[PDB]
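Aim 2 progress. For ribonuclease A, the working sequence is reproduced below.
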Amino acid sequence: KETAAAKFERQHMDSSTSAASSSNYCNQMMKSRNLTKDRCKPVNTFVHESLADVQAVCSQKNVACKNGQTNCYQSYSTMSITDCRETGSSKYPNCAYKTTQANKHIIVACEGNPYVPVHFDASV
Ligand SMILES: *c1cc(*)c([N+](=O)[O-])cc1[N+](=O)[O-]
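Predicted structure tokens for this construct:
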């Protein structure tokens, strides 16, 4: 029902800001995107770039994915990202996150026609 593409946008895209606003950013975002309904994801990354710049990653630098496949692409530039990692005080359903601001290259796996991002592989 929710495509892999759509799930990518829900889990990782945040074009509404240039960077995380407060230390509570990950707590608010994890909750509002419903990323903590099933369990507390241990880590998550949000990307603060336009959808078009992120989709364009699929025509950028081709690299190997962690699983060894070859449909992974690294952004030519660094992108503004927010790192969310569970704190020592997190127990489902009361997940808790540390928000960290970063600027790094993103690596995503792409698939389909249109060829779009479906999985966030790593940040470099
Ligand atoms: C989406 C986001 C997180 C998880 N999870 O298992 O942590 C699963 C899904 N999903 O669409 O299955």
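The two ends are 32 Å apart (CA to CA). This observation will guide construct design in the next reporting period.
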